[PDB]
Each structure stands twice: as C-alpha cells, then as structure tokens.
Amino acid sequence: GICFKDPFGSTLCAPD
Known part of the structure; x- marks a missing residue:
C-alpha cells in the first residue's frame, strides 16, 4: 500500500 518515489x-x- 506504500508508494516510494x-x-x-x-x-x-509497493504491494503493501
């Protein structure tokens, strides 16, 4: 569910 730039x-x- 978390996104990283x-x-x-x-x-x-991310898959989270």
Missing part, C-alpha cells in the same frame, strides 16, 4: 522521477508502488 525515486530521484530519477520513476513512479513505483
């Missing part, structure tokens, strides 16, 4: 600008979300 990278410094490069990539949008990725």
